[PDB]
Amino acid sequence: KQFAVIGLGRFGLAVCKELQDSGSQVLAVDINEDRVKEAAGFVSQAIVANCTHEETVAELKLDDYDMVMIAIGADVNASILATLIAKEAGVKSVWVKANDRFQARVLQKIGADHIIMPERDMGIRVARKMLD
């Protein structure tokens, strides 16, 4: 029912649009104001915040949210650090998007429940669509 999406890039905004279509509350948060405005018309609540800030994550009660998606791609260090802060925040389910195999290794060990690699994961499905 209630979801949170951190990082509103091309991947993160795509999650927000589909989540809203199924009638679910989505908290879209992004450091960049422009990207938050784009998702403002597609989510229940759009907030400009830095999710690397520990106190900011405390205020945004992410432990209440059923699932939290971290969709930060360019800065590998932010996604790793935001994943950790969400874990101490009490988030039971943490989904993290990783662009590299080395990042996906770190995220697995630090405790991410689901690691998403869009290029590798889309590669497998597109092959399956080609086969059938």
Binding site: A40, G41, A46, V48, N50, E55, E59
Partner: protein, 437 residues
Amino acid sequence: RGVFYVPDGAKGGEPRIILLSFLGVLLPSAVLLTLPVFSVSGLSITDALFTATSAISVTGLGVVDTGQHFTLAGKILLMCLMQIGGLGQMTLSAVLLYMFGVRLSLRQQALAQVNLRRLVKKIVTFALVAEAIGFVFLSYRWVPEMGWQTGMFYALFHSISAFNNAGFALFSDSMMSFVNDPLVSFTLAGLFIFGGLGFTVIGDVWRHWRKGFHFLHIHTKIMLIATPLLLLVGTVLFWLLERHNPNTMGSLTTGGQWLAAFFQSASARTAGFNSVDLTQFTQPALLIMIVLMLIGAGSTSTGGGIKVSTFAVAFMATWTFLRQKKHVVMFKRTVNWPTVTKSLAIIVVSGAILTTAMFLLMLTEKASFDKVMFETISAFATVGLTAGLTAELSEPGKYIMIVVMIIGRIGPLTLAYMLARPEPTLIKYPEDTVLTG
């Protein structure tokens, strides 16, 4: 703690919050004043609109006498209005300043402090403690003269009025009987000096005084230096120009003249109280006070005109320009060109509205230019000092004063935020030169 905000969803909306907030309180305040519960005789629509605008803007201009025309309930309403108008602007201006910093801080992190509730609590706490300190000093003298129940009321009304830079008085002649009373004059003087100093100045000094003056914010240093010079220059200039005038200061003692000169020097910067009569002031003294009223109080305070920091930036931008220096420097800090443009634009725009307002006043009512100019500045600068025009103000003149009081109260702050966040555009025209000078 949590540094975040909800974007509006790209021009700033601070201008709209500022106006809606004033009118959202102006209209309810106007309708209440018409009821006979608050007035012994009842106020007409224009008089109530004028009185509400004067109270909400804390201008202090009065079409009717505050002490006599209003009832006991009416004066209590008047305290609520000028507490909403003065502390409310300081609370709102600091609140909007906080959100501006939050948006600016997050913008920096995207490219490469206490919460709001604690800030609002400190602002209200600072107001009530400041009024309470002024309350006991004013009570110390008026309770023996006027009794207990009446003495505390006059102390509370005037301490609230002084701190909020309102200038509303319960006496027929506003503080003209206490020209030679240092305790009343200094208690009131301290109230609107700190009430008009600005919370950012009070806050910066409160948290970083041990570091020293050198490490205070540049705005705090400007207000901590320009205010004493504005007080000192005004005190000396008023004393020099009016020492030989029998009608205003020639009949007072040597100490009484300095106490009167200092009081009007301080009251001009938005309070609006008067130990003497400005109706019988020398013209060179009216021109000095017009400049003092225009400069006004601090940026995030209970009162003000164009504000001291705006005048200070323009004053040193002018000094920079006349010396052909590339940058405007204050306390070893460069004032960026957008800030300089903001200060110059405010003065130019204020003069444009002022000139239009003076021209309209001369048509609606017939009076000399000095009387009209002084009244227009006081209404625009929110000082509320009268030179006799408000007593004989005509019906159309009251409408102009109401508009000028509204624009003068919110204009400098609103125009600053318009300059801060202009609407982004996708079409730019080629730059071309225009000859000036």
